[PDB]
Design a protein around this nucleic acid. Structure first.
Lengths: 135, 132, 249, 113, 37
RNA sequence: UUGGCACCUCGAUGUCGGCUCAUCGCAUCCUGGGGCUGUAGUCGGUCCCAAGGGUUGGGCUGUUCGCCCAUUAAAGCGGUA
RNA sequence: UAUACGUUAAGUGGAAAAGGAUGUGGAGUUGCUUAGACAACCAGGAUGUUGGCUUAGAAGCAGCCACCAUUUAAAGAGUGC
């Protein structure tokens, strides 16, 4: 459950996930990676689920290199409450994702193993994905 | 039917008793017959084949000891490697390689002494032995 | 309080251990059943069976199960009792190590000085039984005009044994349960010093003024640096000796 | 491709080098009996190998019996062969040749005699 | 049966087919028998 | 369901529970027909098709709900201000 | 009830996802392949060896490690029961 240690503002606007990514569109730390085909917010619980999934499938395998970090916080008012009276309290932390963006990489491991692990992770994630490799 | 049995120890029941209680033959007379033939190093785990015709006509054949047995007697050790190629813990001599080769030449397929030696060398790799 | 507690703890464990010890029976039963897995119906209650001394045992069965299932269950129970006994024996080892540690500790505290008590307190706070830098050894005169150093503290004794001497030097301590550790710098002097070290050993021991205390002298090269101060020894000889006076200084 | 070319090449080579060869089936027998045959011909110094019918034919022309399962036994032999055959009797001893003279079944039997 | 939308083969002997426009799985092992619905 | 928004209704839309009267859906409680089973049998579990019919009487509580007694093939979940 | 070219066959059109699938159409890349491929049928599918460790027992297949050599056309110190 990743966390930014320190932040300026505990409360931010949400934002808009228009367009494609700026960077991180291609694997370069590792060999076999995964990228997105949509745009969405992703949570520390999602990423750690995917991470531990692939690492359990691999059991010693090489290196991973996540390519993101949930910097963004997201609020949520308490339950059964009218509107207004200030912005809701923070709940967790979020990473924002554009399409064309690489999320997880892999090295030290064969292609079939990598593809299967990333499949497993994709099923923990909400969005549509693609298997990718380095050029 | 194969049985891995020390020479002088025949009728240590619990392994061998079942080995022929399905056949229903005399376990213990057969065992002392086995000792009588295998008046050998007690502890030498002989491979003995047995063949029983349906009328209880049992005939059994003692054979050369295993490669692991001969190599553990050579190195004077108790066990092969628990993790060979991560921890080699045993070693014997090329002369002993020749010796066990020339011993079990009759049984193997390899007409070549050196090819039989290669077979034993693969065995040594499997059980964590190096050669000198 | 802690040592007494640990002693009573292992008493609890021991008197509890005497009620789940049915391992070997199940082992032998599984052996016999696997040996006799051809005479046996599925649905039977008993089995007149011979041991491989040729007694004849009547093992009970589950009349619903197969002999395979039953024998495997016996192996399972053997496995389980084996596991629990291993657990209890480990706890025993832990508690006894602790008790011996505290017994040596109380010996030291009996034969203590404040300078070592200040170190013992920190040792125990480090052990986290409690809560809240080169001076190590103390010596006096010895035979052959020699100097024999010692430490009533376990930590200082270890510091001297390791960092203040070589491997071929000689360590002199008790040949018995509990006592201090002491030696001269490269202790290779005469039998005069060899017998003089025995007096210093018998003075600071589990039984001071005990006139039958044997001292063990061994090369430091065989001093085992394996809780703390669990130091075994080899390359050792032993000599019966006794306590002495302040002339031991 | 060129590998198969090399293969048919050396087959024709050993063929033209030999002057006794036998052509048999290997079907209906275990690897144990097979290796028994192999060992007795090893000590006989009689070579014995296993090839495919197509490339075998290409080597010969570089005939009718060449179909079906086919192994070959070079003596630069038939005795041991027919002995094994009388022993096991799940075989075909279909053909032979000597000095390039195609030998009949009865003729290879006679050499076995 | 094992009715489910995530229909797959399980063992190598499991054989996917289509029937009446529906997807189904065949195997001698009836526990591997599946269908979408 | 608890709720959020305030769109009709404040020149009046009566609001819990119960009685009578039923009616509809099926994500079926029983009955019917099947697959699988860690389905021996008897009983079961789970899933699938099926809404034709049926789906108890009492004690306590205003109660709904719930607990309890005794039965039943079963004592279904909900919508209809 | 037009013209020409194609697509779909679900009544999609005429309601919706994750995910799943020898659905079909179009492009494209690539391995093998009449010196004979894929499937099918016939036969073989072995030896040190039951690889060794662990295990009461682990003998290709509880698990750890290794996974070599021989007959070899080939047989894994072993794909699944």
């Amino acid at each position: 459950m990743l966390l930014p240690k320190r932040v300026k503002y505990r409360r931010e606007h949400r934002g808009k996930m228009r367009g494609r990514a700026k960077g991180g569109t291609e694997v370069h730390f590792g060999e076999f990676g995964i990228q997105a085909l949509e745009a969405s917010w992703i949570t520390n619980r999602q990423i750690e689920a995917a991470r531990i999934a692939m690492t359990r499938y691999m059991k010693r395998g090489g290196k991973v290199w996540i390519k993101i970090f949930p910097s963004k916080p997201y609020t949520a008012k308490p339950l059964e409450v009218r509107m207004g009276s200030g912005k809701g309290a923070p709940e967790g932390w979020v990473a924002v994702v554009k399409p064309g963006k690489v999320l997880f990489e892999i090295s030290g491991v064969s292609e079939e193993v990598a593809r299967e692990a990333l499949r497993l992770a994709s099923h923990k994630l909400p969005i549509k994905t693609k298997f990718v490799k380095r050029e | 039917v194969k049985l891995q049995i020390p020479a002088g120890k025949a009728n240590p029941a619990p392994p061998v008793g079942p080995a022929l209680g399905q056949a229903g033959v005399n376990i213990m007379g057969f065992c002392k017959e086995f000792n009588a033939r295998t008046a050998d190093q007690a502890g030498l785990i002989i491979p003995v084949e047995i063949s029983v015709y349906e009328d209880r006509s049992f005939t059994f054949i003692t054979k050369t000891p295993p490669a692991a047995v001969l190599l553990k007697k050579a190195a004077g050790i108790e066990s092969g490697s628990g993790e060979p190629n991560r921890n080699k813990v045993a070693t014997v001599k090329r002369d002993k390689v020749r010796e066990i080769a020339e011993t079990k030449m009759p049984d193997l397929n390899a007409a070549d002494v050196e090819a039989a030696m290669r077979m034993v060398e693969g065995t040594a790799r499997s059980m964590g032995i190096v050669i000198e | 309080n802690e040592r007494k507690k640990n002693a009573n703890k292992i008493k609890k464990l021991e008197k509890t251990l005497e009620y789940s010890e049915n391992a070997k029976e199940f082992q032998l039963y599984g052996e016999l059943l696997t040996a006799n897995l051809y005479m046996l119906k599925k649905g039977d209650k008993q089995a007149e069976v011979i041991n491989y001394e040729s007694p004849t045992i009547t093992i009970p069965l589950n009349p619903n199960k197969t002999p395979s299932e039953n024998a495997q269950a016996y192996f399972t129970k053997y496995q389980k009792a084996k596991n629990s006994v291993a657990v209890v024996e480990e706890q025993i080892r832990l508690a006894q190590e602790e008790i011996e540690y505290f017994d040596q500790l109380i010996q030291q505290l009996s034969s203590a000085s404040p300078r070592d008590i200040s170190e013992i307190r920190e040792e125990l706070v480090e052990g986290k039984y409690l809560r809240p830098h080169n001076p190590v050894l103390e010596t006096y005169e010895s035979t052959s005009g020699l100097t024999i150093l010692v430490g009533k503290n376990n930590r200082q004794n270890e510091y001297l044994t390791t960092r203040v001497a070589a491997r071929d030097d000689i360590w002199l301590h008790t040949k018995d349960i509990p006592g201090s550790h002491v030696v001269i710098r490269s202790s290779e002097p005469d039998e005069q010093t060899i017998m003089e070290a025995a007096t210093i050993a018998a003075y600071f021991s589990k039984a001071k003024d005990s006139s039958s205390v044997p001292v063990d002298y061994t090369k430091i090269r065989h001093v085992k640096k394996p809780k703390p101060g669990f130091v075994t020894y080899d390359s050792q000889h032993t000599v019966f000796v006794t306590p002495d006076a302040d002339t031991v200084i | 491709i060129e590998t198969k070319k090399v293969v048919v090449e050396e087959i024709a080579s050993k063929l033209k080098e030999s002057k006794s060869t036998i052509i048999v089936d290997y079907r209906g027998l275990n690897v144990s009996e097979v290796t028994e045959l192999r060992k007795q011909l090893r000590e006989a110094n009689v070579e014995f190998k296993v090839y495919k019918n197509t490339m075998t034919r290409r080597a010969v022309e570089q005939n009718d019996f060449l179909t079906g399962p086919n192994a070959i036994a070079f003596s630069t032999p038939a005795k041991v062969l027919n002995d094994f055959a009388k022993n096991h009797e799940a075989l075909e001893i279909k053909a032979g040749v000597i000095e390039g003279k195609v030998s009949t079944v009865e003729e290879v039997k006679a050499l076995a005699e | 049966m094992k009715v489910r939308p995530s229909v797959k083969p399980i063992c190598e002997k499991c054989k996917v087919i289509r029937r009446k426009g529906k997807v189904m799985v065949i195997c001698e092992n009836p526990k591997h028998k599946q269908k979408q619905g």
